[PDB]
């Protein structure tokens, strides 16, 4: 406790009542002549000190501190996600005990948790003969952490994994689990630093916090305090000279990552460690967003008349792609406008993404898949491909990623529905080159080879299917008459007709003669046919027979509605075509007068049919989200309800922060 | 006696093709989050569209428990949906008497649990399970509710 | 670690594999017959356990857990602010060691930081010759905390005290500092619990975390996780059955407060506990603000109808008053509509407020200000008076509060202007009956009669002075004559320039004869005197002589501006008048045409004087806040200033949460 | 060399009626705040007026290194309200060359800090202290600003 080292490498005096041996060293730093005033031995000691300090980020005494540009670099191969070079590395022959430690961590990372414990027990026996201190102490810590991992893994596999994967997958042999409970039966970690020899207790005291849990408590509380500081300053209009309260957060985060990744410690994959990175990067991006928009009188920009702009570098993308979940990232998506931030080093990030895709292809093209590896890798693989939207991908990288997401990715964690949401999201800031169109067409070819099942139903939680991938093809490139789809359509006959659903949903794409084939083919009798045909715009108007079908549906809905009221339970229903039909009535689409016979059933229907006799207390303000530009224009053109909707929109602009409400109110109603 | 006030709940899973019973008696977090939105679609051609109802829609659910159900879990130890039937009650504020029950039904649920909850200290169980509401391409589904208060 | 105790009062088995020694006890608690089956001694033992478990809120177990309403009752006399009763209780001869320990914390409360150390040293010596180590342990912990507090206090007093308080104040004797620095030089706290006997290390482990600071680490991290979870719940629109993530926070805050305040521990006087309570209250108040604004889609009414809003009782008021600073409350006020939040139990609120109003009077009326005590009480007394504006005060109580705030509250921490702001704030919830008028009149007269010497100038951090103090009176009352002020004026002869002008701008509260007598020798027409005369209604329409003075000011500013440009100096004056004349010329108050000669000096002169040629890029949008409704209405008339001011508004409402911008955008510009 | 980038500041204070310099130099936090507001305090007037443009206005400031003085501290050990000067350096972004000095002056200040840090674990000195830009009725005040870059 003699001095105080700030997070920037500066040093200040804390508890010194004698000579400032820091001050003498730092003046020796700049005095070449005095550096020449040492023996060769002492010169070598100073050189070792200098190299260690320059590698440790310390710079100079705070009294002489000027502009400090501290360097950052992460060198652990596990951080860069190089799963093949590490695979080659493990097979190589060990040389020294440090190599054994590094290989133990590498074995831990790749999901081969079994051999990691055995190698650790090997090194713990073989360590001391060389008289090394640190390696043993760290090897026991890694061992206990990996034991916690194994126990939680087996419990979690037994508990929910049986439902998750459908098979009670056993990654660890029973005798191994029986052993590991025996060896660490009474291991209470707190004593580990209190049992080692006194000589070890005087050299490496700094490594004490890694025993108990406090090493993720001390930094977490400091991050909480800093978060309170920046949040308080964010709502005062304040300006911070020099180091803000936020640059300390970036520095602490990067230093912690260096210490916990270079030293090959295994605490990297624990949830509590992810918790720190989450609220660190979230705070940083929030600060950038706040800086992007505010007001200044004259001197506001005169203070720090520039910014980092949070140029979000490659390490930042690696961190966010690793230590987040999709539900987490959407929270930042709502508040900040991540589109407005700039992506740097648009080439390394491609290397990361193609590495992730390649690993997915390797794992799920061969029958082998280390399930333990799947427990860790899938979250990062999801996050990276989600966040890739803002990244200006190249040709080959786009092709490979689009291939990997569509073909090899397991259906369970990304079904046919949300795969549209991801593949479409990659096209907002990019184009759709011909090769990508070939790939997406190949997907439809595979689905053509699939559409013969007897009980498959393409279960989805977004309500869109392989038709919409061709639809996305056609939105960009209109004249892409499908070819092999024509081949599958022509050969099929009426008897086996489960393919009609998919083929008619892909009526957009077929040959003209294939169109004619589908003409004599197929039928339109129930509402699904009507809506589906209108979905492609084939149906341009309604003959009275179609109106009669609509009326029949309405009568059926009435004849249950009455019973449900007698039975008094409620309902709901998901794809409520009644809301649709209400849209049809208002938009001139159907001018029939019998529709009024079904007023009072659904509030959405009532809000459309009868502006005269519709009271406004049952307005659901989420309605206005799901409306079209033209439909919104038409409702805004009405005189009857404009004022009331205006008020109910004013109130929810004033009492709430949903920006889409804001845009809707000003763009259309004003 | 001064101030706090809480409640309870009840969860009821079921795997289709039979009445397989798996359930949790409570759901403390029980974070239910409906969600509807839209970003962009449509070719904006063909003049008359004659329709538009696109609303994506999806539901999120959460449960805590340690009762995976005592027998057939061990039976399979050594994909026919996971439909759930939520149930609870509601009371009239004027009288504060238990007069109405509530049942919530979901027809097609798919479990998607983040299989990396390896935490760093021995916890009090609590293996939080999160659920997604799924629908085939047929009709209806998601939400149907039963309500008492026949008094 | 056999059983987990959730903060809801339940018990859940974690590590038990043998007999459930915890469940059977509750089994006996519920049953009535089985209690009578035990022996009389064992019946008394069960009664002894029952008296404890009901006192500490452990109600029942989980498999039977139903609807629970846990109690919160803090009974210590320091919480309630009954400072007067403490002085009565201490003046008494103890009959036991426990009483000594109690008086050794009451004295610490009242700021007598020296007399507590002696009694602590008495307790530590007399506590060894018996079998009770709890008193000894807590006494030493409190002693070390008192020593730390004394060291910090003296160090700061030497540091910033000389400028903060105006003189040098050494409340502590030199010998006492020497003795404490002698005693405590070789005491480290971390091994204190280790030093105690084995038996104490055995029974009383439940106090171990109080040895170090790790308890305030392990509470802050657990609050941080819940804050993350609650904000996540907010960003998604989710709901919560069961125990939400906020009730756990409330229960934990009350549990910590009770433990630290009823066992008579001193840590409640420190900063970290203040941080914990500050964030724990802020998160819950923000959640309460968010619940009211929920948008409702399909479930809220059936589940949570007739919203049970967060009720803010007396116990909740004490926390915010005691522990917050005045800026932190202001931070909340800009993101929470705290006016709607109901404030129940107002009767005890009035009593506590009166207590704060009387203790201040006692302290600053007696010649002896306990400067150690004044540091721990001034901030809380400030916050309580601030927060006093959200609750209904009775008349007598309001008179007591106002009398306390106006006269006796020190000039050091409340400038003349801020007193007015707080006084007006207390006029929101309460009207102005003649009693409060009496205190205001007394204050005006007192500051007037103090304003006679030739150097008793004033200051302000709003620039108010008595000018708007009179306006506060006239905004409610209409016919004040202020006999006393008339008495001052009638005897004012001549040659009291500062007295002449001081009551000049207090004109609207004068008598008819005094007004005429003061019009003589009144400040003739200086620009400061000019604007002040307009501010009192003496001047109604501008005369060409007034315009001549205005042109004189403009020319002076232009030559000063030329000098500044030559020197490259810019000004930002609290008496910057350039802004006003633009408004006066826009609305035709001044008909002179020379104003255009000064286009290009100050942006606010150009933005109004020449709307046709103005460079709207220079427009700072903070200006609109200082613009009153009639200017905001006329501003919505002219062409030259409609086409631009709208757009910038559109930009800011989208880019910030400044609801005010949204208001000027909505009610007028659209 | 990767990504931090920092800068420097400096804080000077002074006492009126003498050339006394008793205060810090080097603000670590150096957070600075400006604020303007309005209310209903003039919610009612006789009209036919002009305006007052009250706007309240305020300036908040803070510094943290301490080490005030020892000569002048000694002389003061045995209320002109002080005045503060802020000096910073500015460089042209195109050339990144030191070319201008920013001069800021606040004439009236009144330090009023929370005289209780009371922290549980001893800090490394640095008693952060705040300042309010006081003001009289006369004229000017608040701030005056000068700029170099006469290159």
Lookup: tokens for D119: 């922290």
Residue C451 DSSP code: T
* Cα–Cα distance measured from residue A405 to residue C629, given in angstroms and rounded to the nearest whole number: 58
Q: Do B6 and C311 touch (CB under 8 A)?
A: no
Q: Which of C254, C275, C277, C257 minimizes the C-alpha distance to C265?
A: C257
Q: Which of A135, A418, A420, A373 minimizes the C-alpha distance to A269?
A: A373
Alpha-carbon distance C440 to nearest alpha carbon in chain D (angstroms):
16
Neighbors of chain A with 3 or more C-beta pairs under 8 Å: B, C, D
Count chain A–chain D contacts defined by CB atoms under 8 A.
84
CB C324 within 8 A of CB C383: yes
* Cα–Cα distance measured from residue B135 to residue B106, given in angstroms and rounded to the nearest whole number: 10
Phi/psi at A240 (5° precision): -115, 120
Phi/psi at A67 (5° precision): -90, 120
* Cα–Cα distance measured from residue C362 to residue C374, given in angstroms and rounded to the nearest whole number: 12
Helix spans in chain B (H): 72-77
- Give counts: helices (H), strands (E), chain C: 33, 3
Helix spans in C404-482 (H): 416-429, 434-450, 466-476
Residue C13 DSSP code: E
CB atoms under 10 Å from CB of C489, counted, come to: 20
> DSSP states of A36-102 as a string?
TSS-HHHHHHHHHHHHHHHHHT---BGGG------------TTTTT-HHHHHHHHHSPP-SHHHHHH
Phi/psi at A280 (5° precision): -75, -60
Query: The tokens 């049952």 sit on which residue?
Result: A618
* Cα–Cα distance measured from residue C288 to residue C341, given in angstroms and rounded to the nearest whole number: 8
Strand partners, B58: B35
Write the Ramachandran bin of C600: left for phi over 0, alpha for psi from -120 to 50, otherwise beta: left
CB B87 within 8 A of CB B101: yes
* Cα–Cα distance measured from residue A151 to residue C580, given in angstroms and rounded to the nearest whole number: 74
Task: From residue C461, give the alpha-carbon distance in Å to each of A559, C414, C420, D136, D141.
Answer: 74, 10, 11, 9, 11
CB C265 within 8 A of CB C246: no
CB C116 within 8 A of CB C239: no
- Residue C105: burial class (beta carbons within 10 Å; 0-12, 13-18, 19+): buried
Q: What is the 3-state secondary structure (H, E, C) of C363-383?
A: HHHCCCCCHHHHHCCHHHHHH
Strands C569-572, B33-35: pairing is: unpaired
- Taking contacts as CB-CB distances below 8 angstroms, the residues of chain D near A295 are none
Task: From residue A239, give the alpha-carbon distance in Å to each of A6, A291, C326, D112.
Answer: 22, 10, 20, 20
- Taking contacts as CB-CB distances below 8 angstroms, the residues of chain A near B100 are none
* Cα–Cα distance measured from residue C574 to residue A221, given in angstroms and rounded to the nearest whole number: 42
Any long-range contacts for A516-525 (C-beta under 8 Å, 24+ apart)? A517/A489, A517/A490, A518/A489, A521/A494, A525/A549
Q: List, in sequence order, every beta strand (DSSP E) within C533-653.
A: 569-572
- Taking contacts as CB-CB distances below 8 angstroms, the residues of chain A near C279 are 224, 228
> Quick one: resolution in A?
4.0
* Cα–Cα distance measured from residue A653 to residue A665, given in angstroms and rounded to the nearest whole number: 8
Indicate the angle between helix axes A371-387 and A326-335, nearest 10 degrees. Answer: 20
Torsion of the alpha carbons at C107, C111, C116 and C117, rounded to the nearest 10: 170
Task: From residue A595, give the alpha-carbon distance in Å to each of A559, A583, A587.
Answer: 15, 12, 14
CB B141 within 8 A of CB B84: no
Of A12, A233, A247, the CB nearest to D4: A247
* Cα–Cα distance measured from residue A387 to residue A392, given in angstroms and rounded to the nearest whole number: 11
* Cα–Cα distance measured from residue B105 to residue B84, given in angstroms and rounded to the nearest whole number: 6
- Residue A257: burial class (beta carbons within 10 Å; 0-12, 13-18, 19+): buried
> DSSP states of C23-86 as a string?
HHHHHHHH-STGGGGS-HHHHHHHHHHHHHHHHTT----GGG------------TTTTT-HHHH
**Would you call C493 helix, strand, or coil by DSSP?**
coil
**Would you call A533 helix, strand, or coil by DSSP?**
helix
- Judged by 3 or more CB pairs under 8 A, whether D touches B is no
Residue of chain D nearest C565, judged by CA positions: D146
CB A211 within 8 A of CB A192: yes
Neighbors of chain D with 3 or more C-beta pairs under 8 Å: A, C
Beta carbons within 8 Å of B128's beta carbon, 6+ residues apart: B29, B62, B63, B64, B117
Lookup: tokens for B3: 């101030």
* Cα–Cα distance measured from residue A107 to residue A120, given in angstroms and rounded to the nearest whole number: 10
Strand partners, B23: B12
Q: Which of A601, A648, A574, A532 minimizes the C-alpha distance to B55?
A: A574
Lookup: tokens for A462: 């977004």
What is the length of chain C?
A: 670
Alpha-carbon distance C306 to nearest alpha carbon in chain B (angstroms):
8
Beta carbons within 8 Å of C391's beta carbon, 6+ residues apart: C317, C343, C346, C349, C429
Lookup: tokens for A76: 């652990």
* Cα–Cα distance measured from residue C315 to residue C284, given in angstroms and rounded to the nearest whole number: 14
What is the length of chain D?
A: 151
Phi/psi at D113 (5° precision): -105, 155
Q: Do B1 and C67 touch (CB under 8 A)?
A: no
Phi/psi at C290 (5° precision): -75, -30
Q: Do C247 and B4 touch (CB under 8 A)?
A: yes
- Taking contacts as CB-CB distances below 8 angstroms, the residues of chain A near C649 are none
CB C542 within 8 A of CB C536: no
* Cα–Cα distance measured from residue C384 to residue C359, given in angstroms and rounded to the nearest whole number: 13
* Cα–Cα distance measured from residue C164 to residue C251, given in angstroms and rounded to the nearest whole number: 39
Q: What is the 3-state secondary structure (H, E, C) of C549-576?
A: HHHHHHHHHHHHHHHHHHHCEEEECCCC
Beta carbons within 8 Å of B72's beta carbon, 6+ residues apart: B20
Q: Which of C351, C438, C150 minimizes the C-alpha distance to C269?
A: C150
Indicate the angle between helix axes C133-156 and C115-126, nearest 10 degrees. Answer: 160
CB C233 within 8 A of CB C245: yes
* Cα–Cα distance measured from residue B143 to residue D98, given in angstroms and rounded to the nearest whole number: 67
* Cα–Cα distance measured from residue A305 to residue A299, given in angstroms and rounded to the nearest whole number: 9
Q: Which helix (H) or strand (E) holds B23?
A: strand B20-24
CB C575 within 8 A of CB D138: yes
Q: Do A574 and B135 touch (CB under 8 A)?
A: yes
* Cα–Cα distance measured from residue C383 to residue C225, given in angstroms and rounded to the nearest whole number: 29
CB B60 within 8 A of CB B131: yes
Task: From residue D93, give the alpha-carbon distance in Å to each of A311, C618, D89.
Answer: 17, 22, 13
Indicate the angle between helix axes A326-335 and C214-236, nearest 10 degrees. Answer: 70
Beta carbons within 8 Å of C667's beta carbon, 6+ residues apart: none
Phi/psi at B144 (5° precision): -140, 135
CB A281 within 8 A of CB A315: no
> DSSP states of C321-341 as a string?
HHH--HHHHHHHHTT--TTTS
Beta carbons within 8 Å of A230's beta carbon, 6+ residues apart: A244, A245, A246, A249, A283, A287
């Amino acid at each position: 406790y003699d001095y105080h080292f700030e997070v920037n490498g500066t040093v200040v005096r804390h508890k010194n009542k004698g000579f400032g041996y820091m001050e003498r060293f730092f003046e020796l730093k700049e005095s070449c002549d005095e550096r020449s005033k040492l023996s060769k031995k002492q010169y070598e000691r100073f050189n070792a000190l200098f190299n260690f300090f320059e590698k440790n980020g310390v710079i100079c005494m705070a009294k002489d501190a000027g502009t400090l540009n501290t360097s950052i670099e992460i060198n652990s191969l596990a951080y860069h996600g190089k799963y093949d070079v590490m695979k080659k590395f493990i097979e190589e022959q060990s040389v020294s005990i440090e190599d054994d430690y590094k290989k133990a961590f590498f074995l831990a990372c790749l999901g081969r948790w079994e051999e990691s414990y055995d190698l650790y027990s090997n090194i713990i026996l073989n360590s001391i003969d060389e008289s090394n201190g640190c390696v043993y102490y760290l090897s026991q810590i890694n061992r206990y952490r990996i034991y916690q991992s194994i126990t939680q893994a087996v419990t979690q596999f037994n508990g929910l994994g049986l439902l998750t994967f459908g098979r009670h997958y056993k990654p660890f042999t029973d005798e191994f689990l029986a052993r590991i409970e025996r060896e660490m039966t009474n291991f209470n970690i707190d004593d580990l630093f209190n049992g080692m020899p006194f000589e070890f207790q005087k050299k490496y005291k700094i490594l004490e916090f890694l025993s108990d849990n406090q090493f993720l408590y001390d930094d977490t509380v400091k991050l909480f305090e800093l978060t309170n500081k920046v949040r308080s300053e964010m709502s005062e209009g304040s300006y911070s000279f020099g180091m803000s309260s936020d640059i300390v957060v970036l520095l602490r985060l990067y230093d912690n990552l260096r210490f916990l990744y270079e030293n090959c410690l295994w605490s990297v994959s624990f949830h509590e460690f992810h918790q720190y990175i989450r609220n660190s990067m979230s705070l940083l991006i929030e600060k950038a967003e706040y800086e992007r928009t505010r007001d200044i009188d004259e001197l506001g920009f005169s203070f720090f008349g520039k910014k980092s702009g949070f140029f979000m570098e490659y390490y930042d993308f690696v961190n966010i792609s690793r230590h987040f979940k999709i539900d987490d990232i959407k929270n930042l998506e709502r508040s900040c406008s991540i589109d407005k931030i700039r992506f740097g080093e648009q080439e390394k990030i491609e290397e990361y993404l193609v590495g992730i895709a390649e690993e997915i292809t390797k794992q799920f093209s061969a029958n082998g898949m280390n399930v333990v590896f799947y427990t860790q890798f899938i979250s990062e693989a999801k996050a990276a491909l989600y966040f890739a939207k803002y990244v200006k991908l190249s040709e080959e990288g786009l092709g490979k990623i689009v291939k990997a997401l569509l073909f090899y990715f397991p259906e369970r964690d990304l079904d046919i529905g949300k795969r549209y949401v991801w593949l479409e999201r990659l096209t907002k800031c990019n184009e759709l080159p011909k090769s990508i169109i070939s790939i997406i067409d190949d997907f439809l070819v595979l689905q053509a080879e699939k559409h013969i099942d007897q009980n498959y139903s393409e279960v989805s939680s977004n309500g869109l299917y392989s038709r919409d991938y061709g639809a996305l093809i056609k939105h960009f490139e209109k004249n892409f008459i499908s070819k092999r789809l024509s081949e599958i359509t022509l050969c099929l006959t009426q008897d086996k007709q489960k393919q009609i659903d998919f083929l008619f949903k892909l009526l957009p794409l077929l040959s003209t003669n294939a169109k004619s084939h589908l003409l004599s083919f197929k039928s339109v009798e129930n509402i699904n046919d009507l809506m589906n045909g209108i979905r492609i715009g084939l149906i341009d108007e309604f003959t009275p027979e179609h109106e009669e079908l609509i009326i029949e549906y309405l009568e059926t809905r009435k004849v249950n509605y009455i019973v449900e009221k007698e039975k008094g339970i409620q309902t709901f229903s998901s794809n409520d075509y009644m809301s649709t039909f209400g849209i049809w009535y208002f938009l001139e689409e159907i001018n029939n007068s019998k529709m009024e016979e079904f007023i009072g059933m659904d509030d959405q229907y009532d809000f459309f049919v009868d502006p005269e006799n519709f009271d406004y207390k049952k307005f659901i303000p989420s309605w206005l989200k799901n409306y079209n530009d033209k439909l919104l224009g038409k409702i805004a053109g009405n005189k009857h309800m404009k004022h009331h909707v205006i008020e109910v929109l004013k109130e929810r602009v004033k009492n709430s922060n949903d920006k889409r409400y804001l845009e809707i109110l000003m763009n259309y109603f004003i | 006696m001064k101030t706090v006030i809480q409640d309870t709940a009840d969860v009821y899973f079921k795997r289709k093709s039979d009445g397989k019973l798996v359930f949790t008696a409570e759901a403390q977090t029980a974070s239910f989050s409906q969600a509807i939105s839209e970003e962009k679609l449509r070719g904006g051609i063909g003049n008359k569209p004659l329709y538009i109802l696109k609303s994506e829609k999806e539901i999120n659910l959460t449960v805590k428990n340690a009762f995976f159900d005592l027998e057939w879990l061990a039976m399979t130890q050594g994909s026919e949906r996971y439909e759930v039937e939520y149930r609870t009650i509601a009371y009239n504020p004027d009288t504060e008497e238990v007069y109405s029950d509530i049942y919530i039904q979901f027809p097609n649920v798919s479990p998607s649990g983040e299989f990396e909850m390896s935490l760093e200290n021995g916890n009090a169980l609590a293996p939080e399970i999160k659920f997604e509401a799924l629908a085939d391409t047929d009709t209806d589904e998601m939400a149907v509710v039963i309500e008492a208060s026949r008094d």
